[PDB]
Symmetry: C3
Subunit: 659 residues, 3 copies
């Protein structure tokens, strides 16, 4: 099960199964262990009050691919199939199930979140029978209990050439905030006169279905497709009509043209790749990390991923610094247009950040700890991160400057980077307090180490304020605008303190407490405020054992790996690489949970960190403060013969590393 | 009935009557055969789900002018009046009825959609007595069944000088999308103390009325006016209060000031005119065409006409390429500020076109087949045009570029034209497919000939893509920007094929099918991709008999006329000019239906086409590719002694043509 | 009772009591004569249909500070306390009450509209015991009858260190337009383990409460604080969660940190101050005027004050020219960043002014007589000012140009000032009529003297049209853009006439009528179209006799004062300075009513005028037509030994004047 392009599971065990996701950055479909079913469907950009946190959330959506297959009236069940296998093809995000029904027939089904059509899904079903047989096929549209006020429709769209039967539902999110429409059709090869008659049943309040029968002859394969479109009032004013329009459009494009477009967009994503010689498990794991980041982002949008991307309702679908510092850097090096969408998300929410700053008594733009539709603060009120974890503003500034460093797009810096950098620098200039000694303090925050609450002069927070102020000043210079000279004066005097052993102090109350995640070590990478290798090493030695095994998220060990790679320590770098994700895995597809032994995949934030350990750590790739991508000294794991990284920077460079 | 300024009807026949429209580009009022009634009122910019197509629509509104008149308690009806006449004065959009009631009085009523006050209507009533009589006058506000949740109000607005009685209704469009308010008052000459007492009745759920009595001695003229304001939440946040404010304002202005401003604005519109010597019927018909375009548009707005303007709910009030290619060109030459409003409609909806392109898997801006409030796709889902008729994007680009060519407004090109041309070119660059031979194809469209569905390389569509890419490239140069070299490479290699007889092929599946309307011939005019006179002629000979007599819209024969004028063939040009509209007329005012023998006037699209046959065909006027208006060779109909076109181009040039 | 920083009342008389306001430009809290109660709370920016005028209004909000205090089960009332005093400290907007309860304790309470946290309020209560006692403390959240569909919540926010009990309500404005959230907590000094248990009662439909008991030994001080956050959907998408988040934030900042931040911001505001030597009552009155303008405005916003600021529902909270001409000039000289917010309010409402112009048949931007949320007209329909008092458009233009003169901010002129000046100039160019003598008239207005309705060529109106046209032309020159030459042509020929007595004629129907307020005198100041001191004196001597004692607002005598100050006549200047506000005062805090003997305080318009009489009049300070502030000839009242004005202009200049 160590194909470098395919994740595979034989006989899914429903008692120990964590589904995999196919997604196009707009819709995510999470697999079921049951044949011809999906577990959960998530639509990006649709938020309403729902369950966790009493704040906006992603909403479980229509399981629009759900199918029932019968042979001569006998429904497919666990007890009557064999050689049941699932496979995820990471080359094209195809999720395939295959099984034999008794000794009678073989069934394959592949489904796709179409890469070029953000709101369109397709499942292709192939049935090969060894004897004459009749199939009954049903597609069910069950309204999930997350939605209300549903309506269940069915109609025929016809002309002299086609009969497109549409199974449509329209429903609302819990508070009525968003109207959802879904529209499904069956595609046949045999043409209007010979295609099966489609029946419609509405037997339940929350479910309707379309169905057909088809005679298949011995030794013949019968193929059909299910196309679905899923869209909301967050995406279009009239989702009901747009869903039916899209499904009609996709039906008359046809399966071939749809899969060809899908393949072309996936081929383009995989022009940036990471190849490992000598470690098939690492090769597959790293492909899975790239696959999930590619599936959970979309170029040419203003979409940003949640910590769980489109794998479910993890962290309510909210956007955190998990994007800017964890998922954004590897995407900026491999596909700058993905990074551009992530920062566009923030640019279009700058108004909401100015409003938050004003409500909390500050100048400029104060980005929220958790962001959703509006860009207003969305953190559950019971979590003190929302009111007090202020480094997110610096994290947004850092990503915006990095975008310009890697692309050199000065028109983007004028139109979007500078508005962000100027407003965020104005925030920090208003956020600091000058003390007796002329130093600048940032008092009463929640640390990057979120176990440290309502403390002063957090190392990471203060570091992000310094970088935000420096980068805003640098930006002003590049564009020929005059920056307040106070920004540089403040940056040079923001407190970063050492304990008596010379170790960077996490905050003013810090001695030897356990910490949730990397904080002081982040001043070495990503901030590069600490470059002295002896300082980097003494900070690693003091803090690396401060992170407990339990209830600590995957936002630490990838940084330890990267820093040990920069120190040219192969044994420590590889130890921390494995520790970053292997103890977090869930079967049968090695999806990644947030914490060690956790059960909440897929934590895309964790994948983003590990990709930095591979690209920036083992590959030595670095955003040069002066612009572009440079390469610094690195080591490989002992057992890696070659590391090849393709599509890096706007010159699309290939880097090869060997021992 | 061939007055060059007035359309007149004696004794309206309600069994064979198609009403005429007065409009100010915001409100349209369509005439009733019944005296002192109107059939329908339409407010621009107000759309909701209603009847046809399951998509947004114009909504029948308050018939706010409806009046009941009694003489000595005897109700005035079609059955008991004589010498009843109706007249539309095209000089000032006055609709006038006049009749005799027995031996008592002559009644004249004139109503107006006030040209300067977009939301204000006025009816003026004169009663000339032959005997002593008492009139009872009632103004009815009946909530049409298109509206719901109505409220019926009445109050006196007073000071020492006035008593302004306001009859107000507020109601909602079917889904609650739009709140409509209407407020009416009576104006009297005799002043506060002597004016009639105004009674209010609320006897029905869906109707209330204000009324008065007045004794008039024999041989006197008694005059009163009704002023109404009609506005919605689409136009103003508080329509209820703003309707009352507007009616009070208009009442205090008075009839004389209102009609003087109205006259001044209509006089300005008619400073661009078409004068024909030798053909009184042509002179009246052409004045009717100009009058309807002037009535159905408004300078200094973001309004664009539907194919039926404000004559009713034709095509749901949606905006089509009917504006860009059919109504826009004659308005650009006569009144560029009207053309500016039409293209402003599209500029304001550029973000909705970007959203459509993303949903359908393209780059840039994909303008919708049918547009309404948002600029999202509004085509009924049962019509494949909405998903597949893509030339509308090129049509918007062509109009944008022509606006700049005619005005030379480089500031408008920078702020609005270029955003349109750049985004629409980016769409076409993403829409084409390169083939093995290095040609660019546009596969799977609905043709301009909409009977050809899901075909490849439509002539008109491919031509609009070429022009969009060429004009965007030219625009970039005017503004000192380097357009992507790909735009010219694609433009130069987009497929336009010929059949073995050398005739331009309509699409890759086209041999000799009947066609709905002009498609390949549009490559000659308006696109001017075909300039060779033998090629123009070969294409006319092959396609001119491909358009059936039945169920074919007025989007063909005007182009045939214009092309035969350009070929200096007076007999063919005049044949096609008459065929373009005369078989489409409805009595008694020669309004134009969409198709031959049709009954759905007024098809403003057809008038726009015919006005191009007159201005660009008979007049030889042409948009110069290098800027401004030029004149090419033309002919007149044999029976036209002189054609005079005034107010052309930003120099407001007069063109005179004789034999 | 004549402290230069504090307003004091002994034993409030509920039968003759006009409450004083503490405000931060977002929340106003108006005092009750009853201990530990507030009369009214107003939230800026929240408007809905409510009572007066049938148009949008400020809404009475939660009296969130309402407290009930009992000693040994005995309820504290006005009738059983003694030595009860109230005091407003203008230095920090602290409202303090203090009283003795029998032989048990002294109670002191101080409340604040926190200056740095626009949505946060704090009350601090100190109990100083003379005997052992037990207090019962209740904080009540009563939903006012202005709101509907309330919900009453209570929860504990806890961690190892804190238990923050939140008393929260959520409700809606009358039409459901706005959702309001309020969240309160108690702060204690003693810590989580020792703090009182907080009980919650929900006994009424419209009220819930949180309460505690505390035993206090004799001779001890016990202190507690109430913090509350008040916010709406007009301010934030999710007011419910944002109110709770803000109160948690404020609780974990704590009383000391909040008051320090509050004091810092009030210290900054008072860096611009007016010091009078030899007249303690004038010193205190002028402080009260500065205090109210500082409390009723907020830098770095788009808020503009109503005529009553946040003192209540006066004039529905609508924005009038009372800002541009009355409150804006003193704030522009003292704190340009306050003036910037006031003009930002108009800039962000330019689209609505363009819409109003279009609806009334004009070009450009027509600012409404009364403005609220959208910028559309909000004047009650029964008042003709809404449709007909047109000088407001010139008033906005004047303020926009003055902002540029005083700041010299050319980037602001390009982005905001020019859009205002260009559109308002276009309005006036479309508003004038040229007569047979080549002069420009403005006909059928309501005058600045609002008693003159539907008249022609109002002096002040014509003056503002001239300045608007001139300043738009000067603006075009500053930015190097071409202005229509018609603006200068029109400005030079707009009619301002003299009657046969050599007095400027108010309008074309004016001879000797009583006038509501200053009109023709405003051509001298502020417009400075009349600089001839003899014409100023003629207009002064005539019109100063025409203002009746009754029903005439404080928009007159302050100008008389300033002009007599400019002519160097102390006795007259001082007479009109006193008449401007002293006859409009309400006890016991000398709050200002709109009219002489009025009962509708606080008329901040009136304070604005008088501050101009002091700064521009007695101080001789003037906005120089060429940029910055200059000083012309002035006099002081006989009895004033010295006038000092600090923080003037962007140079922050101090001006000292003596006899």
């Amino acid at each position: 099960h160590q194909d470098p392009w395919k994740l595979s599971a034989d006989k899914p065990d429903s008692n120990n199964y964590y589904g995999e996701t196919v997604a196009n950055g707009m819709i995510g479909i999470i697999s079921s262990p049951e044949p011809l079913k999906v577990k959960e469907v998530v639509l990006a950009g649709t938020y309403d009050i729902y369950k966790r946190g009493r704040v906006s959330s992603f909403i479980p959506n229509y399981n629009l691919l759900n199918m029932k297959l019968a042979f001569n009236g006998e429904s497919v069940q666990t007890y009557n199939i064999n050689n049941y296998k699932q496979e995820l093809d990471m080359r094209n995000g195809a999720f395939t199930g295959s099984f034999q029904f008794k000794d009678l027939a073989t069934v394959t089904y592949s489904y796709y979140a179409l890469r070029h059509l953000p709101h369109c899904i397709m499942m292709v079903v192939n049935i090969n029978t060894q004897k004459d047989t009749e199939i009954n096929v049903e597609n069910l549209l069950e309204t999930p209990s997350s939605l209300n006020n549903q309506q269940n429709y069915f109609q025929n769209i016809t002309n002299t050439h086609v009969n497109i039967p549409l199974l449509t539902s329209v429903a609302f999110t819990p508070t009525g905030r968003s109207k959802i429409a879904v529209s499904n059709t069956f595609l046949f090869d045999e043409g209007k006169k010979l295609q099966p008659e489609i029946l419609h049943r509405m037997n339940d309040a929350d479910m309707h279905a379309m169905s057909f029968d088809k005679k298949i002859k011995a030794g013949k394969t019968y193929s059909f497709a299910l196309i679905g479109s899923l869209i909301s009032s967050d995406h279009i004013n009239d989702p009901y009509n747009e869903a039916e329009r899209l499904t009609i459009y996709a039906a008359l494009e046809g399966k071939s043209r749809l899969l060809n477009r899908h393949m072309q967009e996936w081929n383009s994503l995989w022009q940036s790749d990471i190849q490992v010689e000598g470690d098939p498990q690492a090769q597959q794991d790293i492909r899975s990390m790239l696959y999930h980041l590619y599936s959970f982002t979309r170029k040419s949008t203003s979409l940003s991923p949640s910590p769980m991307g489109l794998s479910g309702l993890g962290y309510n679908g909210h956007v955190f610094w998990d994007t800017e510092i964890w998922m954004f850097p590897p995407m900026l090096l491999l596909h700058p247009e993905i990074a551009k969408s992530m920062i566009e998300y923030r640019y279009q929410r700058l108004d909401a950040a100015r409003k938050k700053a004003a409500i909390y008594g500050y100048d400029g733009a104060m980005f929220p700890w958790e962001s959703a539709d509006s860009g207003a603060e969305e953190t559950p009120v019971n979590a003190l991160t929302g009111a007090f974890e202020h480094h997110v503003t610096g994290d947004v500034a850092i990503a915006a400057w990095q975008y310009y460093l890697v692309t050199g797009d000065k028109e983007w810096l004028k139109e979007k980077g500078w508005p962000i950098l100027k407003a965020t620098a104005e925030f920090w200039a208003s956020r600091v307090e000058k003390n007796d000694k002329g130093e600048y303090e940032i008092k009463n925050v929640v640390a990057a180490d979120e176990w440290a609450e309502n403390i002063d002069n957090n190392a990471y927070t203060n570091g992000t304020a310094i970088r935000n102020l420096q980068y805003a000043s640098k930006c002003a210079t590049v564009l020929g605008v005059i920056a307040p000279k106070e920004w540089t004066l403040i940056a040079d005097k923001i407190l970063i303190s050492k304990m008596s052993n010379g170790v960077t102090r996490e905050h003013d109350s810090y001695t030897d407490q356990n910490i949730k995640q990397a904080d002081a070590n982040l001043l070495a990478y990503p901030l590069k405020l600490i470059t002295d290798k002896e300082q980097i090493e003494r900070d690693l030695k003091y803090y690396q054992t401060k992170i407990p095994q339990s209830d600590t998220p995957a936002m630490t060990q990838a940084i330890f790996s990267l820093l040990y790679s920069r120190l040219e320590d192969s044994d420590q770098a590889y130890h921390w690489f494995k520790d970053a994700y292997q103890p977090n895995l869930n079967p049968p597809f090695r999806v990644i949970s947030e914490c060690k032994g956790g059960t909440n995949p897929y934590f895309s934030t964790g994948a983003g960190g590990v990709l930095q350990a591979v690209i920036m750590g083992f590959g030595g790739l670095d955003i040069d403060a002066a612009g572009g991508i440079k390469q610094v000294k690195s080591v490989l794991p002992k057992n890696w013969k070659k590391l090849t990284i393709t599509g890096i920077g706007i010159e699309k460079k290939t880097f090869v590393l060997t021992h």
